[PDB]
Design a protein around this ligand. Structure first.
Ligand SMILES: CCCCCCCCCC(=O)SCCNC(=O)CCNC(=O)[C@H](O)C(C)(C)COP(=O)(O)OP(=O)(O)OC[C@H]1O[C@@H](n2cnc3c(N)ncnc32)[C@H](O)[C@@H]1OP(=O)(O)O
Ligand SMILES: CCCCCCCCCC(=O)SCCNC(=O)CCNC(=O)[C@H](O)C(C)(C)COP(=O)(O)OP(=O)(O)OC[C@H]1O[C@@H](n2cnc3c(N)ncnc32)[C@H](O)[C@@H]1OP(=O)(O)O
Ligand code: FAD
Ligand code: FAD
Lengths: 607, 607
C-alpha cells in the first residue's frame, strides 16, 4: 500500500484552475460529463492503490528471469495479476480512439488517470501501452494496416518502440539495422537493437507489435534515411487475427538495472537466428523518423508524468511519516532538556523540506496537466482561446519541460522525501528508496536531459521563431499585471520572467555570434540545461500562483474544513516557491550571461 | 581493473604542494616518517584498495549478509571476508593508531588520505576495521585497569561498535531508555534494545567485539547529560591474558534490508533480553557518557564525510574514463551537417559542463577534508597554519559538520552527473555508479542527519564559540582575496565571502531576536542547512583558487607532460567553480534575509 494518490489536487487543476469541464458533454466529449470523469479518477486511484500497487515491491525484489534458449522472460506472478486488473478494468485503453474501443476524453483527463498507474507501478503502464501504440500505427498506416491495428487494439497486443543500438542512442541516425526489400513488398529486418522495453513480456499478451526503425538498403545516412516497420512477434491471419508461426525477432539479453527492474529491458535480435524478421513498411512510405516521433512524443510525456507521479507519492509518504514521528523538542524550547517531545513536523527544517516537496510535486502536476490542455484542439480552443496550430506548437514547446524538468526535479526532490524519514528512509521497508531507483532512469530514456534541452532551444524556440514561447510568456505577464494579497508573489514572478527573458536573449546572442565564430555555439550548449530548468521553475511558480489566486477566491467565498485546509496549502506553496526557489534564477541568468569557452578549450588530459 | 579509480596524485598535491604537511614529516612525533615513505604508503594502500578491497565491492551488494536466528549471528559473503583479511594482513586497521597500541605515528591529514582509498573501494570494509581505533578511544577514556583491556583489544584486533540509537531515540539521543543497573561487584547489567547498529555482528571476522553502549543508570537524570558509557564485550574475557571466555548477553536479533551499503550488517541489538545479563563496565568509572561518546561521534562524522567524498571521486573518474571512449553524435559546430564525423562525448558542451562540475566538487571536497585534518594535530596546525592548540581544536570542530553535512549532500547530488555521463548505461548494474549512489545516500543520515549537522555548525560551532573559529577561517579567505590570472576569481570569492557574512549576520539576528519574540528562532532553523551548504561552496571555491595559485607557480616554473596537464586542470576547475557555483550564494543570501514564519504558522493539515 505504498501508493498515496491525490485525486483532489487533480480535480482542482482540471476543473477549478484549467476549466477542462468546459468541454465535457459537448462535441467530441458529448457522452462524458463532469461527474463521470470524477468517478473514473476515483476508481482508477482506488485500483492503483490496491491491486496495482500490490506488486510494486514484488516486481523489484523478484525481478524477471530470462531463458536464453527460449528467448523469453518470466514475470513474477503478483505483477501479472496486477496487469490483469489493469486489463479487466479497461485501463490499457484510456484515451483510445472510439473506433478502437476507447472512451473519448480530453488528454488532460487521460494523463490524470494514467498518473495513478505510474505512481503505483509504472512498469505496469509501460507494458500496457500496446493499444495506444496500435492507434499510432492505425493513424500512420495504409487501409490494410488499419485493419491490423484494429485487431491489435481489440485483442490488446503489447508493443515496443525499437530504435536504440549499442552505437546509436542519442544519435538515432547512426543506427545500422538494415531492411531488405522482398519481391512481394514485405521487408526482412536484420540487426541487433538494445535497451528495448517490453521486448518480451512472458504470457501477458498473445502478440507483440514491434515498431522498428531500420535503414533500407541503399538509403541515405542519418535519421532521414530511416524507415519504420511493423514487426510482429508472431505472424498472424490478417483477416481474423488468429496467431500464426513465430516471426524472426528474438530477445537475446535482459539487462540488470538500478531500478524499474520489473520492466524487461532487452537486447532484441532481428533475423539473426535463421528465421527472417518480416517487417511491413508503415504507411507504405519511407518516413521513419517522423512516424516514430509520434511515438517518442507520447513516451516523453509519459516519462515526465511518471517522474511527477513518483515524487507526489514520495512526498505524501514522507508527510504521513513526519506527522507521526516524535523526535526532539520544539525549537523554542531547545535549551530545556526536559521540554515535551514533538512530532517532527514541528521542526523548521522538516517544514522547509515538506513544503519544498509539496510545491514542486504540485507545481509539476500543474505543468503536465497544463501541457495536456494543448494536446486537444477543442480543449485548447475552449480553455485558452488558441487555435489548433498554436496549440500544437505550445504542446511541442512544453514536452521537453515535462520530460526534462519533470525527470530531473522529481529525482532531486525525492532526496528530501527520503531525508524526512531519517535513517528509516534508507530501508527497503519504506518505498522511497525504490522511488529513487525507479526514477533515476527518467533523466535518461526517451532522450537524455541534454537532448531535451537541445530540442527545447533549437527546435521548439528558434525553429519555431519563438511563437509558442511568446504565447506562454504573454500569459505569465498577464497574470503579473492583473486583490493585493499576491503582490509580493507577482513581484517575484516579474523578476523571474525578466530573468528567463534575459537567459533567452543571451543564448540567442551566442547563437548569432556563431555566424562569425563557430565555437560560440558551445556557449548555447553550456547553458542549455540550466535554461530548460529555469523555464521549468518559472512555469512552476506561475502555475502555483494561479492556483493560489483560485484558492483565495474559494476561501473568501467561505470554504470550511478540509477544503479550507487544501486552499490554505495552495497559498502557502505558491508563496514559499516564489520566495525560496524563484530568486535563484537571477544568479543563473548572470551566470549564463558570463559563460565562456575556457572549459571547451581545456585539454581533455587536464580533466 | 576494478571499479575503484584512485587519485593519489591529487592527495599528494594537497598534502605537500598546498598545505605543506611534509614540513612536519621527520620531526618530533613524526621523526621516523619522511615524505618519501608517506607517499609510498599512499601508493601502496591505493593499490590494495584497487586490488583485493575493491574485488568484493559488487559481491557484498549482490550477495548481502544474512541473519541466522538459530545462532543470533550474521554471515558475510566469503569474498568480502577475503577483502577484510587483506586489510588486516597489511596492518591497515591500525592506521593512525597510537604507537603504544601498535600504530605508526603520522599526521591526521595523512591518515585520512590513506583511509579515503578504503572508503572509495569498499567503505564497509573500513567500518568493520574501526575496532583498534575504538580501543584507543576506550584507552584514553578508561581507568588504569581498563587501559590494560583496551591494549589487549587493539593487539588482538577485536571489532567494535558504537551503540546509541533506539527506535524512539535517533537524532534525540537523550531520549534513550536503555538502562544500567549496578551490581554488587561494581559491574553493571545493561537492559534495552538498540536499533541500526553497524557491525553489531560480523561473522567469524573477529574473536571478540567491543560494544561501546550508551545507557542510563538507574536513578540518573534525563536527557544526554544523564547517559553513561559502558564497555560491553560480545564475550567475557580474562582481563590479564585476553583469553576469550563465556558469551555475554548482547545479541543481534535482525539485519536491516537497506538501499545500499548492504555488506555493512546493520542490526537491532538486544542487551540482557535473551536469558543472560549483558555485563558492562563503566568507562573511566565516571558518569560522563555523551561527552565520552562524542569522541567516537567526531571520528564517525569525519569518516562519513570522507566516505562520501571518496565515492564521488571514483564516480567522477569512472564517468570521465567512459566519456573519453564513448562516440556519439557530431561536434556541435557541425550539428546541421548530418554526415559530419562522429566525436567522443567529451566534445559536447553539456558533457564538459557535467565533467567539470564533478571534477571541481570532487577535488574541492578533497581539499576541504584534508584542510580540516590539518587542524586535528596541534603540531601540524602549528607548523602549517601557525595556530595554537586551542584555536586549532575549535577550527577542526567548526569544519567537521562541513565535511560531514556538506560532503555527504554534495557527493550524492553530483554523482547524479557522473551517472548521467554514461547515458542509459549508467542505469545498469554493469557499471558501479548506481551502487555508488545507493551506498552514498546513507551519508546524509547516519552519524547525525544534515539538519543536525547544520544545527551543530551554527549553534555550537559558531554561536557558542563566539565566532572565533569562523572569524579565523574568514580571515584566511580574506587574505587570499587581498593578495592577474586570478583577479576574476578573487573578485568572485570576495562576493561569496560577503554573501556568507550576510547570511551569518541575518541568522544571528534571528537567534538574538528570539529573546523578545520566541518564534524568531524558527527562521534560524529554516535557513541553517542552506547556510551550511553556502559555507561549503565558499570553502570549495577558496581552496580551489588556492590550488590554482600553486598551479600557476608550477606552470611558470616549467612543468611539462602529465604534471602540466594536472596543473592546467586546477586552473580550469577553480575558474569554472568561481563563475558557475559561487554566484548562486548571492541569491541564497537574499532568500535568507527574507525568511518568514508563514510556513511555521500553516496548519499541519494544509500540507
Ligand atoms: C511501446 C512501449 C514504450 C514503453 C516505454 C519506454 C520509455 C522509454 C523508451 C525509449 O527510450 S525509446 C528511444 C528514445 N530515443 C530518443 O528519444 C532519441 C534521443 N535523441 C534525439 O532526440 C536527437 O535529438 C535526434 C532527434 C535523434 C537527433 O537526430 P537528427 O537527425 O539530428 O534530428 P533533426 O533535428 O535533424 O530532426 C530530424 C527529424 O526528426 C523529427 N524530429 C526531431 N525532433 C523532433 C521532435 N522534438 N518532435 C517531433 N519530431 C522531431 C523531425 O521529423 C525532424 O525532421 P524535420 O526537421 O522536421 O525536417
Ligand atoms: C565503531 C564502528 C562504527 C562506525 C561506523 C558507523 C558510522 C555511523 C554510525 C552512527 O550513526 S552512531 C549514532 C550517531 N548519532 C548522532 O550523531 C546523534 C545525532 N544527534 C545530535 O547530535 C543532537 O544534536 C544531540 C547532540 C544528541 C542533541 O542532544 P543535546 O543534549 O540537546 O545536546 P547539547 O547541544 O545540549 O550538548 C550535550 C553534550 O553533548 C556534547 N556534544 C554535543 N555536541 C557535540 C559536538 N559537536 N562535539 C562534541 N561534543 C558534543 C557536549 O558534551 C555537550 O555537553 P556541553 O554542552 O559541552 O556541556
Ligand atoms: C545504515 C545505518 C547505520 C546506522 N548505524 C548506527 C550505529 O552504528 N550506531 C548508532 O548509534 N546509530 C546508528 N544508526 C542510527 C542513525 O544515526 C540515525 O538513523 C540518525 O541519527 C537519524 O535518527 P532517526 O533514524 O531516528 O531519524 P529521526 O531523528 O527520527 O529524524 C527524522 C527526520 O527529522 C529530522 N529531525 C529530527 N530531529 C530534528 C531536530 N531537532 N531539528 C530538526 N530536524 C530534526 C531529521 O533531520 C530527519 O529529517 C544507523 C542508521 C543507519 C540508517
Ligand atoms: C531502462 C531503459 C529503457 C530503454 N528503453 C528503450 C526502448 O524501449 N526503446 C528504445 O529505442 N530505446 C530505449 N532505451 C535507450 C535510451 O533511450 C538511450 O539509453 C538514451 O537515448 C541515451 O542513449 P545512450 O544510452 O546510448 O547514451 P549516449 O547517447 O551514449 O549518451 C551519453 C552521454 O552523452 C550525452 N550526449 C550524447 N549526445 C549528445 C549531444 N549531441 N549533445 C550533448 N550531449 C550529448 C548524453 O546526454 C549523455 O550524458 C532505453 C534505455 C534504458 C536505460
Amino acid at each position: 500500500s505504498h501508493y498515496k494518490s491525490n485525486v483532489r489536487d487533480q480535480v482542482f487543476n482540471l476543473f477549478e484552475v484549467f476549466g477542462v469541464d468546459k468541454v465535457l458533454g459537448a462535441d467530441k466529449f458529448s457522452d462524458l460529463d463532469a461527474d463521470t470523469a470524477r468517478e473514473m479518477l476515483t476508481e482508477i486511484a482506488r485500483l492503483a492503490e490496491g491491486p496495482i500497487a500490490e506488486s510494486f515491491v514484488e516486481g523489484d525484489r523478484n525481478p524477471p528471469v530470462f531463458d536464453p534458449e527460449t528467448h523469453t522472460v518470466t514475470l513474477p506472478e503478483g505483477f501479472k495479476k496486477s496487469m490483469r486488473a489493469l486489463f479487466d478494468g479497461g485501463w490499457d485503453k484510456v484515451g483510445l480512439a472510439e473506433h478502437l474501443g476507447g472512451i473519448p476524453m480530453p488528454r488532460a483527463l487521460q494523463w490524470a488517470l494514467i498518473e495513478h498507474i505510474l505512481g503505483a507501478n509504472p512498469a505496469a503502464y509501460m507494458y500496457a501501452m500496446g493499444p495506444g501504440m496500435s492507434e499510432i500505427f492505425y493513424n500512420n498506416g495504409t487501409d490494410e494496416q488499419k485493419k491490423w491495428a484494429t485487431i491489435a487494439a481489440e485483442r490488446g497486443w503489447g508493443a515496443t518502440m525499437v530504435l536504440t543500438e549499442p552505437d546509436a542512442g542519442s544519435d538515432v541516425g547512426a543506427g545500422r539495422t538494415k531492411a531488405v526489400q522482398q519481391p512481394d513488398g514485405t521487408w526482412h529486418i536484420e540487426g541487433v537493437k538494445r535497451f528495448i522495453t517490453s521486448a518480451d513480456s512472458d504470457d501477458l499478451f498473445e502478440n507483440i507489435m514491434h515498431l522498428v526503425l531500420a535503414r533500407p538498403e541503399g538509403a541515405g545516412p542519418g535519421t532521414k534515411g530511416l524507415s519504420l516497420f511493423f514487426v510482429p512477434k508472431f505472424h498472424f491471419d490478417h483477416e481474423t487475427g488468429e496467431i500464426g508461426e513465430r516471426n524472426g525477432v528474438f530477445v537475446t539479453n535482459v539487462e540488470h538495472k538500478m531500478g524499474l527492474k520489473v520492466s524487461a529491458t532487452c537486447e532484441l535480435s532481428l533475423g539473426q537466428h535463421g528465421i527472417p524478421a518480416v517487417g511491413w513498411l508503415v504507411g507504405e512510405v519511407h518516413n521513419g523518423i517522423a512516424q516514430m516521433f509520434d511515438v517518442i512524443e507520447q513516451a516523453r510525456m509519459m516519462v515526465g508524468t511518471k517522474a511527477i507521479a513518483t515524487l507526489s507519492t514520495g512526498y505524501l509518504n514522507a508527510l504521513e511519516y513526519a506527522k507521526e514521528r516524535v523526535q526532539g523538542a520544539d525549537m523554542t524550547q531547545m535549551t530545556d532538556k526536559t521540554a515535551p517531545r514533538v512530532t517532527i513536523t514541528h521542526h523548521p527544517d522538516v517544514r522547509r523540506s515538506l513544503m519544498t516537496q509539496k510545491a514542486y510535486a504540485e507545481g509539476l502536476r500543474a505543468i503536465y496537466l497544463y501541457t495536456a490542455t494543448f494536446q486537444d484542439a477543442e480543449v485548447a480552443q475552449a480553455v485558452h482561446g488558441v487555435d489548433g496550430d498554436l496549440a500544437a506548437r505550445v504542446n511541442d514547446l512544453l514536452l521537453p519541460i515535462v520530460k526534462g524538468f519533470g525527470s530531473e526535479t522529481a529525482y532531486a526532490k525525492l532526496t528530501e522525501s527520503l531525508q524526512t524519514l531519517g535513517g528509516s528512509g534508507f530501508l527497503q521497508d519504506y518505498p522511497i528508496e525504490q522511488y529513487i531507483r525507479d526514477s533515476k532512469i527518467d533523466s535518461l530514456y526517451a532522450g537524455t536531459t541534454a537532448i531535451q534541452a537541445q530540442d527545447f532551444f533549437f527546435r521548439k524556440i528558434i525553429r519555431d521563431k519563438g511563437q509558442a514561447l511568446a504565447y506562454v510568456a504573454g500569459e505569465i505577464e498577464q497574470f503579473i499585471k492583473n486583490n493585493g494579497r499576491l503582490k509580493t508573489e507577482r513581484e517575484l514572478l516579474a523578476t523571474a520572467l525578466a530573468d528567463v527573458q534575459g537567459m533567452a536573449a543571451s543564448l540567442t546572442g551566442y547563437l548569432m555570434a556563431a555566424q562569425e565564430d563557430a565555437a560560440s555555439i558551445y556557449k548555447v550548449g553550456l547553458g542549455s540545461v540550466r535554461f530548460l530548468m529555469a523555464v521549468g521553475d518559472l512555469l512552476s511558480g506561475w502555475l502555483l500562483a494561479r492556483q493560489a489566486a483560485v484558492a483565495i477566491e474559494k476561501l473568501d467565498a467561505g470554504a470550511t474544513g478540509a477544503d479550507k485546509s487544501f486552499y490554505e496549502g495552495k497559498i502557502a506553496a505558491a508563496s514559499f516557491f516564489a520566495k525560496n526557489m524563484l530568486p535563484l534564477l537571477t544568479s543563473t541568468r548572470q551566470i549564463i550571461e558570463n559563460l565562456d569557452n575556457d572549459v571547451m578549450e581545456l585539454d581533455e588530459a587536464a580533466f
